[PDB]
DNA sequence: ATGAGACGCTGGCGATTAGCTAATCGCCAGCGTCTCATCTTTATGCGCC
């Protein structure tokens, strides 16, 4: 999908740390940044849909 | 006593990939014999209810 909204974007130092280039960020990042994403969720900064997309990787990733 | 519902280039090319009767004409066609007998039938020729 074509998405320019903040719900799909994330600022990083380099795009190679996302994991795979054709799917939602790899399990190495979710199981290492879950505490930081939950702490960003309690701070009312990211929305619930953003956290759900950040956590959708461990839910099954992106099927076809 | 919240967390789902909303999903692509195809058509128009080439270019493979595959496959088929039909219309025209020519060629060329197993054949050789004899014996033996056997019967017919025909042409002509001869007769009155």
From Swiss-Prot:
Superkingdom, taxonomy of origin: Bacteria
Free-text note on domains in this protein's UniProt record: Has 2 endonuclease domains. The discontinuous RuvC-like domain (approximately residues 1-62, 718-765 and 925-1102) recognizes and cleaves the target DNA noncomplementary to crRNA while the HNH nuclease domain (residues 810-872) cleaves the target DNA complementary to crRNA. Has a bilobed architecture with a recognition lobe (REC, residues 60-718) and a discontinuous nuclease lobe (NUC, residues 1-59 and 719-1368). The crRNA-target DNA lies in a channel between the 2 lobes. Binding of sgRNA induces large conformational changes further enhanced by target DNA binding. REC recognizes and binds differing regions of an artificial sgRNA in a sequence-independent manner. Deletions of parts of this lobe abolish nuclease activity.
Quaternary context: Monomer. Binds crRNA and tracrRNA.
Family: Belongs to the CRISPR-associated protein Cas9 family. Subtype II-A subfamily.
Name of the featured protein: CRISPR-associated endonuclease Cas9/Csn1
Organism the protein comes from: Streptococcus pyogenes serotype M1
Disruption phenotype: Loss of correct processing of pre-crRNA and tracrRNA. Loss of immunity against a plasmid with homology to CRISPR spacer sequences.
Biotech exploitation of the protein: Coexpression of Cas9 with an artificial single guide RNA (sgRNA) which fuses the crRNA with the tracrRNA in human cells has shown it is possible to target and modify DNA sequences of interest. Cas9 plus the 2 sgRNAs have also been expressed individually in human and mouse cells to achieve DNA targeting; cleavage efficiencies of the artificial sgRNA were lower that those for systems with the 2 sgRNAs expressed separately. Microinjection of Cas9-encoding mRNA and a synthetic sgRNA into zebrafish embryos induces targeted mutations.
Role of this protein: CRISPR (clustered regularly interspaced short palindromic repeat) is an adaptive immune system that provides protection against mobile genetic elements (viruses, transposable elements and conjugative plasmids). CRISPR clusters contain spacers, sequences complementary to antecedent mobile elements, and target invading nucleic acids. CRISPR clusters are transcribed and processed into CRISPR RNA (crRNA). In type II CRISPR systems correct processing of pre-crRNA requires a trans-encoded small RNA (tracrRNA), endogenous ribonuclease 3 (rnc) and this protein.
